[PDB]
């Protein structure tokens, strides 16, 4: 029963159209509880999960402040970066930042993170030890030295190892009836036809939470997994997820096939026939 807190920040440059965009979302596992959008109205850090609505003025006032700080630094990074690579002001670029923590079943610290991306690809990341930085190019080195002098690793690790897990635990308890819930997939299989020869088998996993799941095709112990079709686990819109897999076989060799549904809401990995 592991859990985690993640914060995702996206900032996009608007060549000739004013200030860049700043979206900020905060999750607890596969559930979101906060957001900030420069484009929005309130212009404050807003709740997105009802159990976060219980924190007071002190919380939101602080969180709003820090996200505007995060925005401010990012606003700057876009210009800094553009300089680094000497790119033109005419085009738009993207910056993304992600940091958080993982706790085990004992709910204690377990992992800490902090990746930084530019134009869709790693720019700099904190190593697992939380004392070292990984740069992706000559530009990103400058950032590396710059940060190794300001003591980012020092402060972040304190955050990641301490306050991150302390607050994650607080949320978990508060979102008791929501975050600690584990929904089992309502599996079932369907059968469609292409011709007088090949049929298509599709396994369905529905209403499951968390998203962690591994649907599998199998032939009495073999790997019918090279030629099949997987779909990105998709949200249902109500806090649960959906996913499916399918294979082709001539209207026949269809009773010997197996679907291996793996999810933490299931004691034993499910198996099916039709």
């Amino acid at each position: 029963g592991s859990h985690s807190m993640r914060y995702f920040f996206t900032s996009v440059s608007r060549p000739g159209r004013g200030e860049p965009r700043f979206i900020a979302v905060g999750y607890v596992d596969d559930t979101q509880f906060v957001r900030f959008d420069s484009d929005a109205a309130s212009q404050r850090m807003e709740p997105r999960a009802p159990w976060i609505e219980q924190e007071g003025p002190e919380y939101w006032d602080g969180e709003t402040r820090k996200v505007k700080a995060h925005s401010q630094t990012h606003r700057v990074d876009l210009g800094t970066l553009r300089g680094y690579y000497n790119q033109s002001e005419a085009g738009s670029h993207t910056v993304q930042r992600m940091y958080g923590c993982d706790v085990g079943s004992d709910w204690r610290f377990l992992r800490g993170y902090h990746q930084y991306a530019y134009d869709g690809k790693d720019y700099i990341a904190l190593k697992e030890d939380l004392r070292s930085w990984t740069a992706a190019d000559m530009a990103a080195q400058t950032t590396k030295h710059k940060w190794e002098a300001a003591h980012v690793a020092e402060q972040l690790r304190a955050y990641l190892e301490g306050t991150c897990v302390e607050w994650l635990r607080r949320y978990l308890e508060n979102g008791k009836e929501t975050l600690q819930r584990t929904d089992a997939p309502k599996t079932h299989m369907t059968h469609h036809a292409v011709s007088d020869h090949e049929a298509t088998l599709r396994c369905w996993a529905l209403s499951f939470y968390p998203a962690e799941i591994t649907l599998t095709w199998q032939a009495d112990g073999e790997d019918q997994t090279q030629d099949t079709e997987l779909v990105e686990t998709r949200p249902a819109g109500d806090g649960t997820f959906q996913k499916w897999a399918a294979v082709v076989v001539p209207s026949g060799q269809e009773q010997r096939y197996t679907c291996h549904v793996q999810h933490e809401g299931l004691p034993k990995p499910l198996t099916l026939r039709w």
Partner: peptide, 12 residues
Amino acid sequence: SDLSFSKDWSFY
């Protein structure tokens, strides 16, 4: 939904 991304930086 609020723009978010994945481990590979892709947006969903």
